[PDB]
Amino acid sequence: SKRALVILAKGAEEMETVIPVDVMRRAGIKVTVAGLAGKDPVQCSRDVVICPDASLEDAKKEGPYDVVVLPGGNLGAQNLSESAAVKEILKEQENRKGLIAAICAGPTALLAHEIGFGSKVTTHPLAKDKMMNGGHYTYSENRVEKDGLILTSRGPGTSFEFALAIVEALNGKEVAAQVKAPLVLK
Amino acid sequence: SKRALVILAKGAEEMETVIPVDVMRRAGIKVTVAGLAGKDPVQCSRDVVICPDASLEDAKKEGPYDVVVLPGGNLGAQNLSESAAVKEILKEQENRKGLIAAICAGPTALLAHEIGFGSKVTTHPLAKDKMMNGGHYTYSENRVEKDGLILTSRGPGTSFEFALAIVEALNGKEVAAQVKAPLVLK
């Protein structure tokens, strides 16, 4: 019965969007794919076009959520970083001690909105310098990093591990294992 | 300068659709996401809604393609299997000695359209019995199987390997390696 908000902006990495949405839904999580710009289709980084379930405006009214998920993609992450709406959502989630998950360049939106300073985090290797500007976080090379309520991951190739980490945090290890088996992961 | 046709039907596994599209585009392949039913958005197996680049009807007119890709998802694969349009596309691709790639339950569409009989193939473990009805193929447990112009794979967790195998077949090992590195795969 847990709920997840996935914030989808133009230029988001489509694999880092779809893998967590899919895997979370396999885990019985109620996932809302929310369009940052509105209800209209979103053109992702490699031109896959995804239709969000709702606008971020409407999705927020149906909160709170057990996890707020920020996909990567440099341009997508930048759009998340410049959004006042995202700032408010993340600050509220932080204030209520709710999980926040971000992957690849996604964690740089946490920096932009001053979220989770003092946490151990990882990012895509190419996003490290951006994330570490000011030394507000401690960097990790782990494929998935979880420091309390801040969960981060590195890239498309860590998206399954990232998604399963979210499932484990919300529904437990048993459910994560059950969901993992049919995926045919290495 | 290679070209790929990805046939997207209702109930397709969205991860097995997006990962190959994304990875192939990273490799400089011109990818066309073609909607089986038309130009309208496609509701995938876990409710991700993707807008195709064009209808399959229009996409065919812009052929031939260096690879025809069939995503999995049981209901998606069934829709592919029941389509006369898909039958024609696959038979033409086979006749011109062009690559055909299918993942998870996707290969069962090859069976339905009598494509590549005598080939070594793999599928999702749960799709094996369906695929092997009549013993027209030889089964493999390899995560990716390639027997000449028939390339198959097992599931969401083998989608990156599947995609990179397609890249290697079209653009070579060097390009595949270059595309792989930034993905942060295990």
Side-chain angles (χ1 to χ4, degrees):
Chain A
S1 60
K2 299 293 178 70
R3 300 180 60 183
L5 178 66
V6 180
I7 307 177
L8 178 55
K10 185 179 186 300
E13 222 302 324
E14 43 270 76
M15 300 187 283
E16 296 167 16
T17 303
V18 173
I19 293 165
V21 169
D22 192 314
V23 170
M24 284 189 295
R25 284 178 175 157
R26 286 169 178 258
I29 297 167
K30 304 177 192 186
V31 181
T32 299
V33 181
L36 180 63
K39 310 172 191 296
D40 298 321
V42 180
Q43 185 185 1
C44 297
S45 65
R46 275 69 189 179
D47 285 342
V48 173
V49 177
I50 296 170
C51 298
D53 299 321
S55 64
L56 186 60
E57 185 175 52
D58 290 323
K60 186 192 172 190
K61 295 180 174 63
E62 302 302 312
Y65 298 85
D66 298 286
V67 63
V68 178
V69 182
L70 307 181
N74 285 330
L75 279 63
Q78 187 65 62
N79 286 319
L80 297 173
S81 297
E82 301 180 332
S83 172
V86 173
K87 190 187 297 287
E88 185 168 45
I89 289 172
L90 294 175
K91 286 185 182 300
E92 286 184 45
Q93 185 71 344
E94 185 175 50
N95 291 320
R96 68 183 290 282
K97 305 180 181 179
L99 183 65
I100 296 173
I103 182 162
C104 196
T108 64
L110 305 179
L111 174 60
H113 301 307
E114 303 189 328
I115 304 295
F117 282 10
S119 303
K120 192 170 178 58
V121 303
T122 192
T123 69
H124 192 276
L126 301 175
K128 175 180 180 181
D129 291 351
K130 187 177 188 73
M131 190 64 176
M132 289 302 287
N133 192 327
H136 296 293
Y137 308 94
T138 300
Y139 203 74
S140 172
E141 294 182 1
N142 290 320
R143 295 173 63 75
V144 176
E145 188 57 63
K146 188 181 185 295
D147 197 359
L149 297 166
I150 299 294
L151 195 161
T152 55
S153 197
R154 310 209 78 188
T158 67
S159 291
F160 282 102
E161 297 154 74
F162 174 66
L164 288 169
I166 295 167
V167 171
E168 184 175 312
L170 273 53
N171 295 340
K173 294 183 179 181
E174 186 176 51
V175 171
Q178 295 171 338
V179 170
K180 181 176 180 179
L183 301 175
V184 197
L185 286 161
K186 184 64 180 180
Chain B
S1 60
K2 299 293 178 70
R3 300 180 60 183
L5 178 66
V6 180
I7 307 177
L8 178 55
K10 185 179 186 300
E13 222 302 324
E14 43 270 76
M15 300 187 283
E16 296 167 16
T17 303
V18 173
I19 293 165
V21 169
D22 192 314
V23 170
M24 284 189 295
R25 284 178 175 157
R26 286 169 178 258
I29 297 167
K30 304 177 192 186
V31 181
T32 299
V33 181
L36 180 63
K39 310 172 191 296
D40 298 321
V42 180
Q43 185 185 1
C44 297
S45 65
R46 275 69 189 179
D47 285 342
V48 173
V49 177
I50 296 170
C51 298
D53 299 321
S55 64
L56 186 60
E57 185 175 52
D58 290 323
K60 186 192 172 190
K61 295 180 174 63
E62 302 302 312
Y65 298 85
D66 298 286
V67 63
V68 178
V69 182
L70 307 181
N74 285 330
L75 279 63
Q78 187 65 62
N79 286 319
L80 297 173
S81 297
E82 301 180 332
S83 172
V86 173
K87 190 187 297 287
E88 185 168 45
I89 289 172
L90 294 175
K91 286 185 182 300
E92 286 184 45
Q93 185 71 344
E94 185 175 50
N95 291 320
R96 68 183 290 282
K97 305 180 181 179
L99 183 65
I100 296 173
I103 182 162
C104 196
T108 64
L110 305 179
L111 174 60
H113 301 307
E114 303 189 328
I115 304 295
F117 282 10
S119 303
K120 192 170 178 58
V121 303
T122 192
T123 69
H124 192 276
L126 301 175
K128 175 180 180 181
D129 291 351
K130 187 177 188 73
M131 190 64 176
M132 289 302 287
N133 192 327
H136 296 293
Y137 308 94
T138 300
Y139 203 74
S140 172
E141 294 182 1
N142 290 320
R143 295 173 63 75
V144 176
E145 188 57 63
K146 188 181 185 295
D147 197 359
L149 297 166
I150 299 294
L151 195 161
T152 55
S153 197
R154 310 209 78 188
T158 67
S159 291
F160 282 102
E161 297 154 74
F162 174 66
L164 288 169
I166 295 167
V167 171
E168 184 175 312
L170 273 53
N171 295 340
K173 294 183 179 181
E174 186 176 51
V175 171
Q178 295 171 338
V179 170
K180 181 176 180 179
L183 301 175
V184 197
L185 286 161
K186 184 64 180 180

